[PDB]
Amino acid sequence: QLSPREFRRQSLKLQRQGELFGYFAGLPYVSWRSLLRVLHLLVAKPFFRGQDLLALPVVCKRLGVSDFRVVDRLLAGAVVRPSMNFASPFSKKRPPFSLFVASLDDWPVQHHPHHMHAVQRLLAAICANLHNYTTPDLLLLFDGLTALGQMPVEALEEFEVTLGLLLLQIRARLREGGTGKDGESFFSSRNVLKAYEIVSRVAGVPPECWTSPFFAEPTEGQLTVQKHALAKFLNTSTCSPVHAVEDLLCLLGSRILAV
C-alpha cells in the first residue's frame, strides 16, 4: 500500500514497468490530483505493457473516463504494432487479444457525433491503421476480433465491415507474397493450419453488408473511416470480401492437401 502522493510521484516508473493500475486500485482514496495525473499519463503515453493492458479498460470504466478523445488515444496505442503487445498465435507471456476486446463490452464513449461504445472506436482505429499491418498482424487482429473466448447491434454492421476489409487485405497481401519466398518459408504447416482455422470462423453465410453497396444517399458517418480505408486500398492496390474468403480458403486447403 503506497500513499497517493508517492503513487503519483512514481507513476512514471510504474507505467514503464507495467505495475501502475494495480497500485492505483490499491490506493486508499482517489482524489482529483491522482485522477489528473493518471489521465495526463494516459494521454501523453498511451502505451502500456503487461497486466496494465488488461487493467486499463476496467480502470477506465470504474473511474468513468469515457471521453472519446482519450478512448481513441488508448485504443490507437493498443492497436499500433499489436504483435509487440499481444499474444501472436503463430509460432513474458503477452496476453491474448480476445480478452482485450471482451474487456471493452461496457465502456461507452462520449462527445462523438456517431459512436457510443469503445468497440466502434477500436474498429475505426484498426481500419485507419489497416494499410500498415503485416500479414501476421492482420491475422492476429482478425483472430482476436472473431475469437470465441456481446457487441452492440449499432456496432455490429461496423464490425462486419471491418471483418470484410481485413479479409480483403489479407487476401491482397498473400497474393502479393526473395523476401516473399522468405515469408512463405516462415509460413510453415502450423501457421497455415492456424490461418485456415481462423478463416473457417467466417467461412459460411457471408454477411449481407458485404454484398451491400458499401463494397460495390450519402454514406452515413458511422462508416466514414471504413470508407476511407476502402478508398485507400482500392487506389493503392475489384475483389469482393466473399471472393476473398473463397480464395483464402482454397489456397489454404490446397497448401494443406499438398498431434
Added chain:
Amino acid sequence: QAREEQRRQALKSFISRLDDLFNLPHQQWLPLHSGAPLGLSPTNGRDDALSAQEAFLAACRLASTRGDFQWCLQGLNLLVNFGRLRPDWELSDRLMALSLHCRRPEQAEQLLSAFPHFLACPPSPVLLFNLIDEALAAGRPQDVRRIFATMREQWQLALRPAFYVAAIRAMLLLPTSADQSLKEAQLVAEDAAALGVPLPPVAHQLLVERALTLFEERLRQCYTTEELLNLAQESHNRLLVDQARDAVRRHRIPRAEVSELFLWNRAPNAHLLAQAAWLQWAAERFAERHNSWIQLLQQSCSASLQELAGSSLHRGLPPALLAALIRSSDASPLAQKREIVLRKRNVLLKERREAAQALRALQHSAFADKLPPVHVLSALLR
C-alpha cells in the same frame, strides 16, 4: 387502517415541511448535494446531509396510492420551481417505479413520452418491459404498439431485439382477425429488418408459423395464398440471416443434392429442419394445385435424436403441421373433366403417401411424445 393513516399523515407532513422550508430563505434550504473531497477522514463530509432530492425520494417511499402519487408530483413540482432538481438515472427510474407502484400506467406512458423535455435520462429498460407486461395483462396489447413506437423513435432508448419480440407477440395477440394480426406483426418485423436489427429466432418462428397456419387454412378449400407463402419464405430467410448475425455478434437432381448437403452438414437443428420441410411441402402443394420435403422431415427427426443424445428459439412441432399431415393421411378415396378428376386423385394419393411417410418418421422422432396417439383423428371425427 391505523398504519395506512399514519403513513399518509407522514407523507403529507413531509411534503408540507419541504414546502415551508422552501418558503424560508435560501440559506436555510437543504443543500443541493453533500460535498466533495478536498472541499474516517477520507469518508468525512461525503454523504452527511439530506439533500432536497433525497428528502423528496424519502417522502415518495411513503406513497402507495393513486392519491399519494399526486403528493409525489407536488414534491417534484416544488423541486422544479425552486431549482433543487438534478435529473439523473436515479430520478428517472424512481419516478417510473413510483408511477407503476401507485398503479398509474397512464402516468407511466406520459412520463415515457414527456421525459425528453425536462429530464436528463430515460427510464430503465426493465421498467419499460414491465410497462409492456402490464399493458398485456390489462387486455390491451395494442398499447404495446404505441409504447414500442415511442421507444424506437426516442434516440436515448437503445434498440433491443427483446422489445421487438414482445411487440411482435403482442401484435399477434391483438383481439382482431388473424390476418390483420399477422399483418401488424409483419409491419413490426419489416421495421426491424429495415433498421438492421437481428431479431431472435423465436420472432421469425412465430411469423412463419402464423403464415403457414393461414396458408393451410386457405388451402383447406387480407393476404392471398401466394402472399402467405412469400411472407413465410422471406421470414425464414431472415431467420437464417439473423441467426448467422447473432452468432457473429456473440462469437430429381436437386433432390439428390439434398442428400449430399445433409451428409456434409455439420449438425442441423431439428426445429429449423421441421419448418423448412413444412415450407417445402407447402410450396410443392401450392405448385401442384396451380398446375422432397420427406427428406427434410427425416433429417429433422434424425437431428432431434442427435440433440437428445448430446438457443433462444421456440421448441416444438407445429400443431398446424400435425393437423395438415393427419388430414392428408386421412385422404378419402372418394375425395377432359374425367381426366382432370383422375389427375386430382393421383395427386391426392401422392399427398397421402407423403403424409403417411411423414407420420412414420415422426413416430420414431423425438417429437412423438408430444403427439398423443389417435388424437388428431378423433378431433377430426368429432
Added chain:
Amino acid sequence: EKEVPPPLKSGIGEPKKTGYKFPHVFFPYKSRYRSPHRQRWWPGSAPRFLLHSHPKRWAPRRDLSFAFFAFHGLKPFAEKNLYELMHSLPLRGASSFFWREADSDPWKHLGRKANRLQARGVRTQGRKQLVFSPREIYYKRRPFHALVFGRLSVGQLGASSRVLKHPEIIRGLSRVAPPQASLGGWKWRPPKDASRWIFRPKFPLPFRPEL
C-alpha cells in the same frame, strides 16, 4: 374593469422575492415615469428573458400530471425558443443546423404599433440566412435555459416554407453563443451524414388504424 400590469412573479429555479409596496421609484408623484425593468405585458411585446418569462408554475395536485412538466418543450412555434427546441432533439440538437425565421414575431402582427410607417413602404412582394450548429451544450434549467456554443455561418435557404441547402456558404465564427436564442421561431435540419441509430426514422404507421 381595467387592464393593469400583471402581478410580478419569480422565475422557475429561483427562491421567492419579497417585492415592493409601490409600483416604481417615483410613485405617485411622477405618474409618467417608466422603469427600464418594467415587465412588458401589453400585446405585441416579448417578456424579458429570465426576469418575467418562465414564471413559477403552480397547479392544484388534482390536475398535476407528468405532461404538466413538458409545457416549455410543447410551447408553440412562435414562442418556443432555441433551448426548448434543442432539449428533445437527437444529441440535444448538436451537429445539426438551426436558423430563425422572425416572420411570426408577436410585434410584427399584434399591438397598437404593429402597423406604422416604414422607411421603405408597404409590402407587395431563396435567401441567405444565418446558420448555427451547436457543439457545446449545458442546461442550467431544463429545457429553457442553457449555455450553448457553436459554429455561426452564412447558409442558403430555398424553396421547399423554406429548406436549408448549403449551411456553409461562408465561414463565420467557430464558437459563439446562439444568436436570438432567447425567443423566436427556430427551424432545424439534421446533418447530411446522419446515422439512423441516432436520428430514428419514423415508426411505420398502422395499416388499419382501428378505433
Added chain:
Amino acid sequence: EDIAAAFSSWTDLANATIDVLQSVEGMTNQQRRLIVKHVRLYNHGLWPEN
C-alpha cells in the same frame, strides 16, 4: 373603396393636394400621410420596388 370612389382617376390621386385629401370623407391623418408618402415614392421610382 370609398377613398377610391372619391378619387376618380390615378392622375387625380397623384396630383391631389393635402386639402383635397382632408376634404375626402372618412380619411384620417395617418391615411393621408401614408397616401402622400407612397405617391411620392412611386413618382420617384422607389416603390413598389422597395
Added chain:
Amino acid sequence: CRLSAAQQERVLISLPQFQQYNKELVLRDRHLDFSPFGKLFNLREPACGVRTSRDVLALVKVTNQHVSRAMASVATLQSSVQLWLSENGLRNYCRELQEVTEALARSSRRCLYTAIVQIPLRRKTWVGPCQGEVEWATQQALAIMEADGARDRTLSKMAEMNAIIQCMQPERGIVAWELRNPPRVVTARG
C-alpha cells in the same frame, strides 16, 4: 426502508423539529440488515448470500424476467389454442395456468417496483471522483498535453499513433451535448 412512527413524530411534527433533525432521514446500507433477505432468497452455503440492497434488486430482477417470459409463453399458447378453437380440456387447463401465471407475474412486478422505490439511493462504495471532477480532469489533461506540444513547437510508434488519430478524428469535431459543468476553456502554462 420506510419511516417509522418514532421518526414521523420526532422530525415530521413541525418545521423547527424537521430542521433540527432532518439529517436522520438518510437511509444508507448501514441502516439495513440482510439476514431475512438471505433467508427468503435461500442462498444456502456455499452461496454468497445477500450483502446489499442492490443484490436484492438483482435477484428480484432475475425472478421477474423468468416469470414475465413464462407469462408471455403462456399467453402465446392461449392465443394458439384460441386459433384452434376458431378453426375442452385445453382451455380447462389454460384457465388455471393463466390464472397462476398472471398472479405470479403481478407479484414479481410489484416486488420489482417496491424494490426500486424503497432501496436507498446509490452512492459510490469508495472515495472517488464525481462526474464533474472526471470531466474537468479530462479537459485539463488534454489542455496540458496541448500546451506541452505548443511548448515543444522509438518515436516511430508515437508518430504512427498520431497519424491514426488524425485519420480517425471526426471531420466536424467534438460534439459535447451532455456537459456536466458549464462550458469552459481550460488552459495550462505548458
Added chain:
RNA sequence: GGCGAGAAGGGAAGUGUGUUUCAAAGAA
C-alpha cells in the same frame, strides 16, 4: 436591448437669491 423623458417645479434660502467685473486645456 439602446437613447430621451420634472404637467417644464416658485415647496428652501436676507445678507440669501440674483446682478456687475473676471477666469476656466486637452494630446501634460
Added chain:
RNA sequence: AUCCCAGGCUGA
C-alpha cells in the same frame, strides 16, 4: 454565504 450572473480567471 451560496439564490442568480449572456461576468470572469485559475488547478501538473
Added chain:
RNA sequence: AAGGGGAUGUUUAGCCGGGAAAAA
C-alpha cells in the same frame, strides 16, 4: 425465449467582481 430485461453509474474545488431577498 435457461442465459444482455445483464453490468457501470457521490456532488468539480477555489478567488475576484456585480445583483436580489433575509438581517442590519
